[PDB]
Amino acid sequence: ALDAAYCFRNVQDNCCLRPLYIDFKRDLGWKWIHEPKGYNANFCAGACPYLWSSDTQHSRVLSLYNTINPEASASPCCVSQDLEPLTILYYIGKTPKIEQLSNMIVKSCKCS
Amino acid sequence: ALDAAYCFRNVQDNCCLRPLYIDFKRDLGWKWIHEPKGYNANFCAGACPYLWSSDTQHSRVLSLYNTINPEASASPCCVSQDLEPLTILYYIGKTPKIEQLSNMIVKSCKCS
């Protein structure tokens, strides 16, 4: 899979999972989230050559088209595949609010 | 939607559907497909600013992160949303083969 095991601690140009830890206050200026203070959002980035983790038939065809005609700028894109949720705690005055946000953390990537 | 109505015949920088007709033989060198001779594959391309057709919570958060820190190269990507199939006819010797390929044509885009 295009996951941490394959992707982290390898520097490759093709589509792969890239690590990214976001500190809510420091990076986004969100001072209102109480816990957690940050999380491993991660992201997907890299080239999508022919048949490299192709999502659909369209990704397969476009990955071949883009190899032949790169000027078209029609390459498939390296995007999230598997994601995980994140539970946050924030206050609303003194009313503690707990919310489970789905699809917050990316665990694997694909060429779509 | 980020579809033909909004996107074609407008030249915008943000994520949008882009037209692309592929001629099998001329563009891909696939001489073995009998009908159709080509089709409207189309593609998705363009910038993903904060909240522009955000797919998941991760796309929402990363679109804000990328606005503040563009060097990170962590932007969400403009990718297919709705797709359509395409039926092709090809021969295998003199055995006509008919296949319906799913997700061949892109009709709308999203920032994922």
Side-chain angles (χ1 to χ4, degrees):
Chain A
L2 298 178
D3 60 6
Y6 183 62
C7 306
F8 291 6
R9 56 90 200 196
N10 104 353
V11 131
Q12 81 157 108
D13 281 348
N14 288 339
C15 177
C16 236
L17 183 73
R18 314 282 172 185
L20 177 72
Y21 180 88
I22 292 175
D23 189 285
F24 294 115
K25 137 155 60 123
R26 155 203 102 210
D27 291 323
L28 301 185
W30 296 358
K31 282 216 263 210
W32 50 284
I33 285 139
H34 189 77
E35 180 65 49
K37 287 340 172 288
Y39 72 114
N40 293 291
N42 303 323
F43 65 100
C44 294
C48 286
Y50 182 58
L51 306 177
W52 184 264
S53 308
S54 291
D55 188 15
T56 60
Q57 296 290 155
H58 186 273
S59 330
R60 297 186 227 281
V61 182
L62 272 299
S63 69
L64 179 51
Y65 185 91
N66 177 71
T67 300
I68 300 166
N69 188 356
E71 22 276 299
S73 291
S75 180
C77 207
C78 191
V79 286
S80 306
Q81 174 180 261
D82 301 322
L83 295 115
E84 272 166 18
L86 175 86
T87 298
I88 60 167
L89 177 64
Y90 61 98
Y91 289 88
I92 197 116
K94 49 156 15 177
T95 305
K97 242 254 103 221
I98 274 264
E99 52 173 338
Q100 189 194 86
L101 306 171
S102 63
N103 304 321
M104 283 282 285
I105 292 159
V106 55
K107 300 299 257 189
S108 65
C109 305
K110 66 183 180 183
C111 279
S112 193
Chain B
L2 298 178
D3 60 6
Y6 183 62
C7 306
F8 291 6
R9 56 90 200 196
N10 104 353
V11 131
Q12 81 157 108
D13 281 348
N14 288 339
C15 177
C16 236
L17 183 73
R18 314 282 172 185
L20 177 72
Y21 180 88
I22 292 175
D23 189 285
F24 294 115
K25 137 155 60 123
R26 155 203 102 210
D27 291 323
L28 301 185
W30 296 358
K31 282 216 263 210
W32 50 284
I33 285 139
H34 189 77
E35 180 65 49
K37 287 340 172 288
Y39 72 114
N40 293 291
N42 303 323
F43 65 100
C44 294
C48 286
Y50 182 58
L51 306 177
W52 184 264
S53 308
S54 291
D55 188 15
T56 60
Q57 295 290 155
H58 186 273
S59 330
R60 297 186 227 281
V61 182
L62 272 299
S63 69
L64 179 51
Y65 185 91
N66 177 71
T67 300
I68 300 166
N69 188 356
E71 22 276 299
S73 291
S75 180
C77 207
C78 191
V79 286
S80 306
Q81 174 180 261
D82 301 322
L83 295 115
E84 272 166 18
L86 175 86
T87 298
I88 60 167
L89 177 64
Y90 61 98
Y91 289 88
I92 197 116
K94 49 156 15 177
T95 305
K97 242 254 103 221
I98 274 264
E99 52 173 338
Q100 189 194 86
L101 306 171
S102 63
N103 304 321
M104 283 282 285
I105 292 159
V106 55
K107 300 299 257 189
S108 65
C109 305
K110 66 183 180 183
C111 279
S112 193

